[PDB]
Amino acid sequence: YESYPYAITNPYHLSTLATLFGINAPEVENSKILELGCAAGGNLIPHAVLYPNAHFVGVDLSKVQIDEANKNVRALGLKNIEFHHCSITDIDDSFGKFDYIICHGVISWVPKIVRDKIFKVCNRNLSTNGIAYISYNTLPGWNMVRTIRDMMLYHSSSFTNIRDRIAQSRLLLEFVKDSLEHSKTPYAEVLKTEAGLLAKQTDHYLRHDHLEEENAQFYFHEFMNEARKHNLQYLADCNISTMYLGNMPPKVVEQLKAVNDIVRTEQYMDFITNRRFRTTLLCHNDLKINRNINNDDIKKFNIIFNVIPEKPLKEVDLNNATENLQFFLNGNKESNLSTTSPYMKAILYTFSENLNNPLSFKQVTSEANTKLNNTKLNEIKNELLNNAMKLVLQGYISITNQKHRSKPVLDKPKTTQMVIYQAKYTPSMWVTNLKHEPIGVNFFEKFALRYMDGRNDKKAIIEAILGHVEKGELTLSREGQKIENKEEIRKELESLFTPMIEKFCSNALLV
Amino acid sequence: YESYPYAITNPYHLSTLATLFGINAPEVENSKILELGCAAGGNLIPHAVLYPNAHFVGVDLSKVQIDEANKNVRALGLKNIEFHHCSITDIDDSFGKFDYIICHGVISWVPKIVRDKIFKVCNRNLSTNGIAYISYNTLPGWNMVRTIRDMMLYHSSSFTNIRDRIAQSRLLLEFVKDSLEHSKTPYAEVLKTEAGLLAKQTDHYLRHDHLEEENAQFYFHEFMNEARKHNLQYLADCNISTMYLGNMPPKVVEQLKAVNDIVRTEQYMDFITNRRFRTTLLCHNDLKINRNINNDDIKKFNIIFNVIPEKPLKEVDLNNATENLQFFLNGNKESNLSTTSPYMKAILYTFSENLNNPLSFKQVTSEANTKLNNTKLNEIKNELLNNAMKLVLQGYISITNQKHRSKPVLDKPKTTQMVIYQAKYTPSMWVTNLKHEPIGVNFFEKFALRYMDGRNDKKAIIEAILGHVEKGELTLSREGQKIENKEEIRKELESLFTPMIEKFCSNALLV
Ligand SMILES: C[S@@+](CC[C@H](N)C(=O)[O-])C[C@H]1O[C@@H](n2cnc3c(N)ncnc32)[C@H](O)[C@@H]1O
Ligand SMILES: C[S@@+](CC[C@H](N)C(=O)[O-])C[C@H]1O[C@@H](n2cnc3c(N)ncnc32)[C@H](O)[C@@H]1O
Hints:
2 copies of one chain form a homodimer.
Chain A: H1 11-21, E1 32-36, H2 45-50, E2 55-60, H3 63-76, E3 81-85, E4 98-103, H4 112-124, E5 126-137, H5 142-156, H6 164-179, H7 186-200, H8 220-228, E6 232-237, H9 250-258, H10 263-273, E7 277-284, E8 302-304, E9 307-309, E10 325-329, E11 336-339, H11 342-351, H12 361-369, H13 377-392, E12 398-400, H14 417-424, E13 430-432, E14 438-440, H15 444-450, H16 458-471, H17 493-506
Parallel strand pairs in A: 1-2, 1-4, 2-3, 4-5
Antiparallel strand pairs in A: 5-7, 6-7, 8-12, 9-10, 10-11, 13-14
PDB class: transferase
Keywords: methyltransferase, rossman fold, sam binding protein, methylation, transferase
Assembly: dimeric
């Protein structure tokens, strides 16, 4: 019962993935967004703060949460969002026509009647050019998760209390990690890791009630068949890399490319890759979508490539073409790309100081062009054009319709309204950034964001945080777990401050 | 659509696992054996030839098969066996009470009503000390088989031909064996193998009607649940090694040993080992079974350990404890065991000349004591006593209630009546041995067995086969590639003869 944002749900990501396929979706700046199964609305409210001219509606069956959502909407003072306590089946054509309909993690947990109704409202209540989003669990991938859920019910059947039946399942998952300690068999690998990721989870799914729930257990084509019954058509997935073919032998790529149905192509890919989950984008049946995508399409979007250089800029010469420089993707150990070309090296160093900041094609191109003394522009353009889209379809590069943001002022840092409201008034250990992603903080950053407005500067902010450490409410961790009253504060804050402002500036927490 | 014997179904194997657990099952020599879903009865008739004083009944729904069964029963002239074309549902209480009821690979393919009936007839028609056998596909193991079968139907629907849609799925399993050519991922392993053993299967399993069939998809505890409704109790599995614990951390063995339930012990092992199949032995609820098994219980049975030494006896000294001798189990490279102990060396060299010939504890012990110069009797006994049961519950050693057989006479070898009928009048490349196992023969072996009666000897048998090669009907080629004159044969017959009499003598094909 903690409401998280899901960045894959952002209406801007749907407008972008549509724009990539040829549909012009409504503008998000002023739109109608619907959320089926909202509450507590952490996937809705942060949008209503950033877009005051759009209209947000949300629907849920738990009154407990719909009241909490309204408790936050009342604290932030928003007029553009309203939450309704009712069921999806209660939505007629009078609700209006929405530009983006977001259904996340519900349609597989509800009875067939509610399913048919969701498929209806994604037709009756969807605009002419609008877009619908539905996430669900698929087969075969879910076969393992179902199995574990059965293995826990069969065990936890010997215990009754809701306080006894949970830690029990948590002890059965440990018992599984013990009996499989020494196993070569390739199956005990999947079971070992899936019980490790289920054991890491907390108490919500693990309640023996949620384990009794039956899942729609879709196959992608059964889902699409119920979708075409309602005159909807498959747009794309929200992870474009899941649609990536090849990374596959070329005779099979040719075969699949021969068949002209994308649905039984994605089905096959589901069968051979053991897909367990899908985030599907649906659009009205009357739209003509274009699947011929070429490198030159990279100019229609703004680009985000989060790469951390392996050596600082002033420490290298880009024209050294024998030097093989490598960059790490949001991280890292391994997960890296190495280039020896001066133009690709100039582009990645531009992407490495713009982290999580959309950049147009002329901004990436011109800003990489001044590291090369303004002479090499056409060679920069020619490498971006060539490798770009190819890297967008593999997932490494993110495209967006969101505009570039002005580099923040770090004199007196200033964060967004949503994260000051989450830092001051909220028990949660994470905040929502401008990209609609939850990012973690440890009580120090949270307290810092409490005081980060365009007013308090470095000194003032630290003295306030210190104010918290006295009444604390505030520990000092390090290596560590000790604080000496004076020598472990105000000399330990000035250390952690600069890099934390780094993390904020590069994670889109500063406006 | 070829009738095969299943050695794991032999009433003597059930009488043996029962004896092992404390139940005295009826004599197999004269009993009442039932088979649900028998025809064409290749799993029944070979028993009716060896036990003329026992009564065999079988039931099947295919007249096409019951006609063949009845024709083979007519060709052998058997009065002790009768086949009925009817349904399991057509069974009265008037059918009698059978000492062994054998249901192999049906209960998962039949509607819930027929399942109810099978569990019923395994109660009302089973004797007081009798035993029932039911094999079925289980979960989780079957999930993969379900996936693949769905993967074929969804594919093969684009054409409706019973002759097209088959070689179609045959080419889809190839499209699967290709697109996974280079893959590390362990799921592509499971899928790689499961499509490989499915493509090796031929034209029947793939019939696309039998892909349309739905499986009961049992869990062991759901099966034991329908068994206890009918007052049946779990006896054991016909693969004793599947009930073996550890191979498992001793804390996990202790934990399972704490809860006393055999059903949820086998259920948890089914969960962690991904059990796909079960051959279950059921017995009446009123019986007291003993699960305490001690090393010295190996004296109640007769022993078969098929080991092929790596060195001839005359080539080694058993008394040398510095020599590490290696033995191969039914084969082989790979599966083998090496021992340096002189007593285990005398026991394994005693089991290696008795292959597939049950041997009592005093025969193994007395014959292994004469290899050590008759000084070691109590040391041989104590090593058999110790390692025996431990190796029986692991699968390496076979126990049986069947008696030792008199060493056959190789002057004029004489094979059993069942394989003479199969050699002469059946176009099968395999015959059924005395242990009820199908064993292959190649065109030479078949022709040889045609003439093996207690009359024809070496020269005569060879002249007969030579006669065949003249009219042949028999192509004899060395590699070689077309021997073939006159005494380049009869010199190839005296060659192929001796190793074949060895092969027959140790496969229980010679009486
Ligand atoms: C299965 S939960 C998933 C919650 C959330 N989207 C997530 O995973 O983070 C679905 C949410 O939908 C709401 N819900 C369930 N059934 C509904 C229905 N029939 N009509 C409207 N809302 C419903 C519930 O309050 C529940 O919190
Ligand atoms: C899987 S095959 C049986 C295999 C069995 N393990 C054997 O080979 O001895 C299923 C056979 O069972 C028979 N059968 C199917 N349904 C039956 C029913 N309801 N009653 C009796 N026999 C049935 C059919 O004749 C079919 O040939």
